[PDB]
């Protein structure tokens, strides 16, 4: 039974570690989502400023 | 002619113990008044008659269902040369409990690995000369 119990302990530890892995996976995924939303925001602003600076550069070189 | 007996047999290698289950019996002959007997089964390891196990007494049925389980803490090495004995007894309150039947199972014929469970026909228990001694001499 020592063979079996030893293994039992192993499976229990694996269980705990798996639970922790679950929590970590949840935090991971959530923060990944939020960061993705933030990146979307960044690309919106970056395109806005791209247009801004293109138009501004054209207007600036226009008076030359 | 008494009837048959359904039993289960298997070995637990995790605890090193023999698991003998008494399922039921059928078509037992009636020895009591009402037309039905009061049967109970005594089970013990055939090699050594120690720590015999007895089931609960069922009242007036020729088809008793015990569905009980017994455990024999015996190593797997010793098991091979050990036999199982399952004898069906008839309970009587005011006299000796007559044996209805008996059955012996050699553990070298038994195959463990798959859970065994079978019906086997009961036979009449053996009652030879007591002395068993011999004397040798010459006549001239
Ligand atoms: Mg009786």
PDB file of C-alpha atoms and ligand atoms in Angstrom:
ATOM      1  CA  UNK A   1       0.000   0.000   0.000  1.00  0.00           C
ATOM      2  CA  UNK A   2       3.036   2.234   0.406  1.00  0.00           C
ATOM      3  CA  UNK A   3       3.420   2.185  -3.362  1.00  0.00           C
ATOM      4  CA  UNK A   4      -0.196   3.268  -3.718  1.00  0.00           C
ATOM      5  CA  UNK A   5      -0.163   5.925  -1.021  1.00  0.00           C
ATOM      6  CA  UNK A   6       3.074   7.487  -2.238  1.00  0.00           C
ATOM      7  CA  UNK A   7       1.331   7.870  -5.590  1.00  0.00           C
ATOM      8  CA  UNK A   8      -1.750   9.231  -3.838  1.00  0.00           C
ATOM      9  CA  UNK A   9       0.284  12.046  -2.259  1.00  0.00           C
ATOM     10  CA  UNK A  10       1.735  12.799  -5.688  1.00  0.00           C
ATOM     11  CA  UNK A  11      -1.750  13.056  -7.194  1.00  0.00           C
ATOM     12  CA  UNK A  12      -2.863  15.373  -4.384  1.00  0.00           C
ATOM     13  CA  UNK A  13       0.081  17.722  -4.933  1.00  0.00           C
ATOM     14  CA  UNK A  14      -0.620  17.617  -8.670  1.00  0.00           C
ATOM     15  CA  UNK A  15      -4.223  18.530  -7.844  1.00  0.00           C
ATOM     16  CA  UNK A  16      -3.211  21.591  -5.825  1.00  0.00           C
ATOM     17  CA  UNK A  17      -0.684  22.744  -8.411  1.00  0.00           C
ATOM     18  CA  UNK A  18      -3.339  22.283 -11.106  1.00  0.00           C
ATOM     19  CA  UNK A  19      -5.735  24.505  -9.164  1.00  0.00           C
ATOM     20  CA  UNK A  20      -3.081  27.194  -8.860  1.00  0.00           C
ATOM     21  CA  UNK A  21      -2.429  26.818 -12.596  1.00  0.00           C
ATOM     22  CA  UNK A  22      -6.141  27.418 -13.151  1.00  0.00           C
ATOM     23  CA  UNK A  23      -6.105  30.649 -11.149  1.00  0.00           C
ATOM     24  CA  UNK A  24      -2.944  31.791 -12.969  1.00  0.00           C
ATOM     25  CA  UNK A  25      -4.511  30.990 -16.343  1.00  0.00           C
ATOM     26  CA  UNK A  26      -7.569  33.065 -15.435  1.00  0.00           C
ATOM     27  CA  UNK A  27      -5.538  36.110 -14.353  1.00  0.00           C
ATOM     28  CA  UNK A  28      -3.343  35.683 -17.427  1.00  0.00           C
ATOM     29  CA  UNK A  29      -6.241  35.545 -19.883  1.00  0.00           C
ATOM     30  CA  UNK A  30      -8.133  38.426 -18.279  1.00  0.00           C
ATOM     31  CA  UNK A  31      -5.150  40.763 -18.304  1.00  0.00           C
ATOM     32  CA  UNK A  32      -4.435  39.696 -21.884  1.00  0.00           C
ATOM     33  CA  UNK A  33      -7.972  40.779 -22.829  1.00  0.00           C
ATOM     34  CA  UNK A  34      -7.688  44.154 -21.093  1.00  0.00           C
ATOM     35  CA  UNK A  35      -4.299  44.759 -22.694  1.00  0.00           C
ATOM     36  CA  UNK A  36      -5.829  43.903 -26.077  1.00  0.00           C
ATOM     37  CA  UNK A  37      -8.509  46.548 -25.546  1.00  0.00           C
ATOM     38  CA  UNK A  38      -5.746  48.988 -24.606  1.00  0.00           C
ATOM     39  CA  UNK A  39      -3.816  48.110 -27.782  1.00  0.00           C
ATOM     40  CA  UNK A  40      -6.959  48.780 -29.816  1.00  0.00           C
ATOM     41  CA  UNK A  41      -7.127  52.202 -28.161  1.00  0.00           C
ATOM     42  CA  UNK A  42      -3.449  52.777 -28.961  1.00  0.00           C
ATOM     43  CA  UNK A  43      -3.939  52.002 -32.651  1.00  0.00           C
ATOM     44  CA  UNK A  44      -6.973  54.299 -32.795  1.00  0.00           C
ATOM     45  CA  UNK A  45      -4.988  57.198 -31.314  1.00  0.00           C
ATOM     46  CA  UNK A  46      -1.944  56.386 -33.458  1.00  0.00           C
ATOM     47  CA  UNK A  47      -3.967  56.424 -36.665  1.00  0.00           C
ATOM     48  CA  UNK A  48      -5.565  59.689 -35.529  1.00  0.00           C
ATOM     49  CA  UNK A  49      -2.160  61.301 -35.002  1.00  0.00           C
ATOM     50  CA  UNK A  50      -0.908  59.803 -38.270  1.00  0.00           C
ATOM     51  CA  UNK A  51      -3.690  61.580 -40.150  1.00  0.00           C
ATOM     52  CA  UNK A  52      -3.103  64.719 -38.061  1.00  0.00           C
ATOM     53  CA  UNK A  53       0.599  64.844 -38.885  1.00  0.00           C
ATOM     54  CA  UNK A  54       0.118  64.002 -42.570  1.00  0.00           C
ATOM     55  CA  UNK A  55      -2.431  66.787 -43.051  1.00  0.00           C
ATOM     56  CA  UNK A  56      -0.343  69.170 -40.943  1.00  0.00           C
ATOM     57  CA  UNK A  57       2.805  68.371 -42.931  1.00  0.00           C
ATOM     58  CA  UNK A  58       0.970  68.941 -46.203  1.00  0.00           C
ATOM     59  CA  UNK A  59      -0.400  72.280 -44.975  1.00  0.00           C
ATOM     60  CA  UNK A  60       3.048  73.264 -43.690  1.00  0.00           C
ATOM     61  CA  UNK A  61       4.840  72.460 -46.952  1.00  0.00           C
ATOM     62  CA  UNK A  62       1.989  74.225 -48.766  1.00  0.00           C
ATOM     63  CA  UNK A  63       3.208  77.592 -47.470  1.00  0.00           C
ATOM     64  CA  UNK A  64       6.671  76.989 -48.927  1.00  0.00           C
TER      65      UNK A  64
ATOM     66  CA  UNK B   1     -29.768 -32.157  -5.700  1.00  0.00           C
ATOM     67  CA  UNK B   2     -29.915 -29.603  -2.896  1.00  0.00           C
ATOM     68  CA  UNK B   3     -29.396 -26.629  -5.194  1.00  0.00           C
ATOM     69  CA  UNK B   4     -26.783 -24.288  -6.645  1.00  0.00           C
ATOM     70  CA  UNK B   5     -24.660 -21.484  -5.184  1.00  0.00           C
ATOM     71  CA  UNK B   6     -23.704 -18.162  -6.789  1.00  0.00           C
ATOM     72  CA  UNK B   7     -20.512 -16.666  -5.372  1.00  0.00           C
ATOM     73  CA  UNK B   8     -17.831 -14.101  -6.229  1.00  0.00           C
ATOM     74  CA  UNK B   9     -14.038 -14.354  -6.006  1.00  0.00           C
ATOM     75  CA  UNK B  10     -11.182 -11.896  -6.627  1.00  0.00           C
ATOM     76  CA  UNK B  11      -7.873 -10.749  -5.129  1.00  0.00           C
ATOM     77  CA  UNK B  12      -6.929  -7.201  -4.122  1.00  0.00           C
ATOM     78  CA  UNK B  13      -3.236  -6.714  -4.852  1.00  0.00           C
ATOM     79  CA  UNK B  14      -3.223  -3.242  -3.303  1.00  0.00           C
ATOM     80  CA  UNK B  15      -3.954  -4.526   0.205  1.00  0.00           C
ATOM     81  CA  UNK B  16      -2.804  -8.123  -0.361  1.00  0.00           C
ATOM     82  CA  UNK B  17      -6.104  -9.679   0.737  1.00  0.00           C
ATOM     83  CA  UNK B  18      -8.626 -12.155  -0.684  1.00  0.00           C
ATOM     84  CA  UNK B  19     -12.136 -10.830  -1.354  1.00  0.00           C
ATOM     85  CA  UNK B  20     -14.757 -13.590  -1.155  1.00  0.00           C
ATOM     86  CA  UNK B  21     -18.340 -12.558  -1.807  1.00  0.00           C
ATOM     87  CA  UNK B  22     -21.343 -14.745  -1.069  1.00  0.00           C
ATOM     88  CA  UNK B  23     -24.041 -13.689  -3.507  1.00  0.00           C
ATOM     89  CA  UNK B  24     -26.850 -16.212  -3.151  1.00  0.00           C
ATOM     90  CA  UNK B  25     -28.101 -19.788  -3.422  1.00  0.00           C
ATOM     91  CA  UNK B  26     -30.947 -21.494  -5.290  1.00  0.00           C
ATOM     92  CA  UNK B  27     -33.138 -24.619  -5.362  1.00  0.00           C
ATOM     93  CA  UNK B  28     -32.086 -25.721  -1.866  1.00  0.00           C
ATOM     94  CA  UNK B  29     -33.909 -28.797  -0.529  1.00  0.00           C
ATOM     95  CA  UNK B  30     -36.344 -28.214   2.349  1.00  0.00           C
ATOM     96  CA  UNK B  31     -35.551 -29.815   5.710  1.00  0.00           C
ATOM     97  CA  UNK B  32     -37.830 -27.757   7.952  1.00  0.00           C
ATOM     98  CA  UNK B  33     -41.553 -27.847   8.771  1.00  0.00           C
ATOM     99  CA  UNK B  34     -43.011 -24.941   6.788  1.00  0.00           C
ATOM    100  CA  UNK B  35     -41.774 -26.373   3.504  1.00  0.00           C
ATOM    101  CA  UNK B  36     -38.710 -24.134   3.571  1.00  0.00           C
ATOM    102  CA  UNK B  37     -35.430 -24.310   5.503  1.00  0.00           C
ATOM    103  CA  UNK B  38     -33.491 -21.641   7.424  1.00  0.00           C
ATOM    104  CA  UNK B  39     -30.168 -21.501   5.531  1.00  0.00           C
ATOM    105  CA  UNK B  40     -26.867 -19.806   6.397  1.00  0.00           C
ATOM    106  CA  UNK B  41     -23.459 -20.216   4.764  1.00  0.00           C
ATOM    107  CA  UNK B  42     -20.163 -20.852   6.557  1.00  0.00           C
ATOM    108  CA  UNK B  43     -17.096 -19.784   4.558  1.00  0.00           C
ATOM    109  CA  UNK B  44     -13.451 -20.335   5.507  1.00  0.00           C
ATOM    110  CA  UNK B  45     -10.047 -20.858   3.913  1.00  0.00           C
ATOM    111  CA  UNK B  46      -9.728 -24.528   2.974  1.00  0.00           C
ATOM    112  CA  UNK B  47      -6.071 -24.970   3.954  1.00  0.00           C
ATOM    113  CA  UNK B  48      -6.329 -24.071   7.635  1.00  0.00           C
ATOM    114  CA  UNK B  49      -9.674 -24.018   9.427  1.00  0.00           C
ATOM    115  CA  UNK B  50      -9.049 -20.799  11.315  1.00  0.00           C
ATOM    116  CA  UNK B  51     -11.245 -17.716  11.616  1.00  0.00           C
ATOM    117  CA  UNK B  52     -14.193 -19.228   9.757  1.00  0.00           C
ATOM    118  CA  UNK B  53     -16.737 -16.683   8.531  1.00  0.00           C
ATOM    119  CA  UNK B  54     -20.486 -17.139   8.911  1.00  0.00           C
ATOM    120  CA  UNK B  55     -23.321 -15.238   7.172  1.00  0.00           C
ATOM    121  CA  UNK B  56     -26.574 -14.023   8.720  1.00  0.00           C
ATOM    122  CA  UNK B  57     -29.404 -16.537   9.171  1.00  0.00           C
ATOM    123  CA  UNK B  58     -32.234 -16.201   6.643  1.00  0.00           C
ATOM    124  CA  UNK B  59     -35.654 -17.388   7.767  1.00  0.00           C
ATOM    125  CA  UNK B  60     -37.655 -19.878   5.693  1.00  0.00           C
ATOM    126  CA  UNK B  61     -36.340 -19.462   2.136  1.00  0.00           C
ATOM    127  CA  UNK B  62     -35.106 -22.066  -0.351  1.00  0.00           C
ATOM    128  CA  UNK B  63     -33.570 -19.230  -2.344  1.00  0.00           C
ATOM    129  CA  UNK B  64     -31.632 -17.153   0.215  1.00  0.00           C
ATOM    130  CA  UNK B  65     -29.865 -13.966  -0.850  1.00  0.00           C
ATOM    131  CA  UNK B  66     -26.951 -12.994   1.380  1.00  0.00           C
ATOM    132  CA  UNK B  67     -24.991 -10.539  -0.795  1.00  0.00           C
ATOM    133  CA  UNK B  68     -22.281 -10.493   1.888  1.00  0.00           C
ATOM    134  CA  UNK B  69     -18.502 -10.087   1.694  1.00  0.00           C
ATOM    135  CA  UNK B  70     -15.539 -11.546   3.584  1.00  0.00           C
ATOM    136  CA  UNK B  71     -11.834 -10.659   3.545  1.00  0.00           C
ATOM    137  CA  UNK B  72      -8.955 -13.087   4.066  1.00  0.00           C
ATOM    138  CA  UNK B  73      -5.720 -11.240   4.836  1.00  0.00           C
ATOM    139  CA  UNK B  74      -3.462 -13.682   2.998  1.00  0.00           C
ATOM    140  CA  UNK B  75      -0.357 -12.909   0.907  1.00  0.00           C
ATOM    141  CA  UNK B  76      -0.416 -13.751  -2.792  1.00  0.00           C
ATOM    142  CA  UNK B  77       2.399 -16.302  -2.561  1.00  0.00           C
ATOM    143  CA  UNK B  78       0.700 -18.415   0.113  1.00  0.00           C
ATOM    144  CA  UNK B  79      -2.619 -18.097  -1.727  1.00  0.00           C
ATOM    145  CA  UNK B  80      -1.717 -20.530  -4.511  1.00  0.00           C
ATOM    146  CA  UNK B  81      -1.668 -23.558  -2.242  1.00  0.00           C
ATOM    147  CA  UNK B  82      -4.784 -22.456  -0.410  1.00  0.00           C
ATOM    148  CA  UNK B  83      -8.336 -23.631  -1.003  1.00  0.00           C
ATOM    149  CA  UNK B  84     -11.722 -22.072  -0.256  1.00  0.00           C
ATOM    150  CA  UNK B  85     -14.619 -23.816   1.474  1.00  0.00           C
ATOM    151  CA  UNK B  86     -18.237 -22.668   1.265  1.00  0.00           C
ATOM    152  CA  UNK B  87     -20.687 -24.902   3.127  1.00  0.00           C
ATOM    153  CA  UNK B  88     -24.441 -24.335   3.345  1.00  0.00           C
ATOM    154  CA  UNK B  89     -25.953 -25.049   6.757  1.00  0.00           C
ATOM    155  CA  UNK B  90     -29.559 -25.345   7.928  1.00  0.00           C
ATOM    156  CA  UNK B  91     -30.364 -23.535  11.170  1.00  0.00           C
ATOM    157  CA  UNK B  92     -32.391 -25.290  13.858  1.00  0.00           C
ATOM    158  CA  UNK B  93     -33.117 -23.707  17.236  1.00  0.00           C
ATOM    159  CA  UNK B  94     -33.401 -26.903  19.291  1.00  0.00           C
ATOM    160  CA  UNK B  95     -30.880 -29.247  17.653  1.00  0.00           C
ATOM    161  CA  UNK B  96     -27.622 -29.574  15.731  1.00  0.00           C
ATOM    162  CA  UNK B  97     -27.461 -27.406  12.616  1.00  0.00           C
ATOM    163  CA  UNK B  98     -27.407 -29.949   9.792  1.00  0.00           C
ATOM    164  CA  UNK B  99     -25.138 -29.296   6.821  1.00  0.00           C
ATOM    165  CA  UNK B 100     -27.098 -28.860   3.602  1.00  0.00           C
ATOM    166  CA  UNK B 101     -24.111 -28.734   1.273  1.00  0.00           C
ATOM    167  CA  UNK B 102     -20.462 -27.840   0.702  1.00  0.00           C
ATOM    168  CA  UNK B 103     -18.121 -26.647  -2.041  1.00  0.00           C
ATOM    169  CA  UNK B 104     -14.330 -26.526  -2.333  1.00  0.00           C
ATOM    170  CA  UNK B 105     -12.358 -24.296  -4.706  1.00  0.00           C
ATOM    171  CA  UNK B 106      -8.628 -24.883  -5.388  1.00  0.00           C
ATOM    172  CA  UNK B 107      -6.696 -21.612  -5.710  1.00  0.00           C
ATOM    173  CA  UNK B 108      -4.485 -23.028  -8.467  1.00  0.00           C
ATOM    174  CA  UNK B 109      -7.492 -23.440 -10.739  1.00  0.00           C
ATOM    175  CA  UNK B 110      -8.688 -19.924  -9.922  1.00  0.00           C
ATOM    176  CA  UNK B 111      -7.551 -17.180 -12.297  1.00  0.00           C
ATOM    177  CA  UNK B 112      -7.192 -13.717 -10.783  1.00  0.00           C
ATOM    178  CA  UNK B 113      -6.976 -10.573 -12.874  1.00  0.00           C
ATOM    179  CA  UNK B 114     -10.619 -10.438 -13.838  1.00  0.00           C
ATOM    180  CA  UNK B 115     -13.314 -10.364 -11.156  1.00  0.00           C
ATOM    181  CA  UNK B 116     -14.680 -13.912 -10.986  1.00  0.00           C
ATOM    182  CA  UNK B 117     -18.325 -14.725 -10.220  1.00  0.00           C
ATOM    183  CA  UNK B 118     -20.014 -18.062 -10.868  1.00  0.00           C
ATOM    184  CA  UNK B 119     -22.755 -20.575 -10.076  1.00  0.00           C
ATOM    185  CA  UNK B 120     -21.626 -23.969  -8.803  1.00  0.00           C
ATOM    186  CA  UNK B 121     -23.684 -27.025  -7.884  1.00  0.00           C
ATOM    187  CA  UNK B 122     -23.640 -28.028  -4.221  1.00  0.00           C
ATOM    188  CA  UNK B 123     -22.593 -31.525  -3.172  1.00  0.00           C
ATOM    189  CA  UNK B 124     -22.979 -33.661  -0.050  1.00  0.00           C
ATOM    190  CA  UNK B 125     -20.265 -33.210   2.572  1.00  0.00           C
ATOM    191  CA  UNK B 126     -17.953 -36.126   3.327  1.00  0.00           C
ATOM    192  CA  UNK B 127     -18.490 -37.989   6.587  1.00  0.00           C
ATOM    193  CA  UNK B 128     -13.077 -43.440   6.364  1.00  0.00           C
ATOM    194  CA  UNK B 129     -11.526 -45.666   9.046  1.00  0.00           C
ATOM    195  CA  UNK B 130     -10.142 -43.741  12.024  1.00  0.00           C
ATOM    196  CA  UNK B 131      -7.002 -45.738  12.916  1.00  0.00           C
ATOM    197  CA  UNK B 132      -5.131 -45.566   9.586  1.00  0.00           C
ATOM    198  CA  UNK B 133      -2.307 -47.651  11.045  1.00  0.00           C
ATOM    199  CA  UNK B 134      -0.650 -50.775   9.669  1.00  0.00           C
ATOM    200  CA  UNK B 135       1.345 -53.692  11.080  1.00  0.00           C
ATOM    201  CA  UNK B 136       3.725 -55.868   9.048  1.00  0.00           C
ATOM    202  CA  UNK B 137       4.892 -59.358  10.001  1.00  0.00           C
ATOM    203  CA  UNK B 138       5.972 -62.707   8.526  1.00  0.00           C
ATOM    204  CA  UNK B 139       4.353 -66.142   8.809  1.00  0.00           C
ATOM    205  CA  UNK B 140       6.158 -69.476   8.472  1.00  0.00           C
TER     206      UNK B 140
HETATM  207 MG1  LIG C   1     -34.943 -24.520  11.557  1.00  0.00          MG
END
